[PDB]
Amino acid sequence: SMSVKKPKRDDSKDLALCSMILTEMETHEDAWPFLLPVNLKLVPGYKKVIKKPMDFSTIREKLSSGQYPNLETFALDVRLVFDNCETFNEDDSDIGRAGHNMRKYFEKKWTDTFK
Amino acid sequence: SMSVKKPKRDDSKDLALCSMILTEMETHEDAWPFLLPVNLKLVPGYKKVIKKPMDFSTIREKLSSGQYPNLETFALDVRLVFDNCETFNEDDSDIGRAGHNMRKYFEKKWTDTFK
Ligand SMILES: Cc1ccc(O)c(CO)n1
Ligand SMILES: Cc1ccc(O)c(CO)n1
Numbered sequence: 001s002m003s004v005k006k007p008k009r010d011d012s013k014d015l016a017l018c019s020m021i022l023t024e025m026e027t028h029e030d031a032w033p034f035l036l037p038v039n040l041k042l043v044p045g046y047k048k049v050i051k052k053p054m055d056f057s058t059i060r061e062k063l064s065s066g067q068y069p070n071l072e073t074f075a076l077d078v079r080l081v082f083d084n085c086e087t088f089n090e091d092d093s094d095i096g097r098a099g100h101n102m103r104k105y106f107e108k109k110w111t112d113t114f115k
Numbered sequence: 116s117m118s119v120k121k122p123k124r125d126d127s128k129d130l131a132l133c134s135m136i137l138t139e140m141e142t143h144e145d146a147w148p149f150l151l152p153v154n155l156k157l158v159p160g161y162k163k164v165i166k167k168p169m170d171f172s173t174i175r176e177k178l179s180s181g182q183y184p185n186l187e188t189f190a191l192d193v194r195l196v197f198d199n200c201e202t203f204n205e206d207d208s209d210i211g212r213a214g215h216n217m218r219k220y221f222e223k224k225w226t227d228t229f230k
Contacts, residue, residue, distance in 0.1 A: 001181035002189065003130035015118035066116035074117065 011071070018074050019063060021109050025078070026056055028105060030098040034081050050088060054080040071114065078106055126186070133189050134178060136224050140193070141171055143220060145213040149196050165203060169195040186229065193221055 025031060037055045040047045059077050061067075068074045085099030140146060152170045155162045174192050176182075183189045200214030 001130075002133065002178075002183045002185055003127055004181060012118055015116075018117065063117075066119060068117045070117055 014071050017113055021113060022060060022063060024109060025106060028102060030101045031056065033095045033098050034102065050084050052080060054084060075110060129186050132228055136228060137175060137178060139224060140221060143217060145216045146171065148210045148213050149217065165199050167195060169199060190225060
């Protein structure tokens with residue numbers, strides 16, 4: 001509260017660390033469904049069903065232009081990529097399986113890096 | 116943004132300074148309408164019309180128990196006291212005039228202390 005400060009993380013390396021994690025995500029062989037925005041003009045249903053589209057290129061742009069206030073807003077956007085994938089794609093599908101794999105991959109990097 | 120820190124105020128004295136300002140408010144001769152909560156059982160209309168009642172004793176309790184995260188939330192509650200007063204009381208009235216006087220009194224102390 002006012003004039004009662006909680007000891008806080010050293011957050012000085014967060015930007016570099018998130019960039020490294022995102023690079024690992026981008027270079028994963030199962031990243032292909034998530035590198036670019038879903039084409040709203042060519043994919044039926046997507047625009048109406050997925051209220052907040054997100055993809056790695058968009059995350060990279062936001063990270064590079066100071067659009068994440070902190071760690072957690074970055075992780076929210078990454079998780080949004082996989083939440084959208086799960087909403088739109090059957091678990092059994094190639095894209096569906098890619099999403100589950102990439103989510104697991106991310107969360108391990110996340111824990112190992114910040115926890 | 117992430118890992119880009121803005122130079123910040125020294126806020127270490129804010130708690131003490133707000134307490135001093137509130138003491139000056141409490142001891143002002145025109146503070147009498149605002150020292151205790153308006154009696155909702157005895158004052159017709161108040162409960163329905165004033166959605167967020169506030170008074171100096173309530174502010175003092177919140178300040179003393181860590182319920183203001185920062186300066187600005189404290190100032191919001193003080194201003195709420197006078198906004199409520201203006202809503203419910205004619206400018207011409209004793210209480211109405213007291214509110215205008217106390218608002219002016221507060222804002223001068225506020226500027227002189229933090230600006
Ligand atoms: C390329 C791609 C990636 C993710 C996704 O949900 C879709 C829609 O089937 N398409
Ligand atoms: C004592 C007091 C203080 C402020 C106020 O608005 C009222 C309602 O007339 N009564």
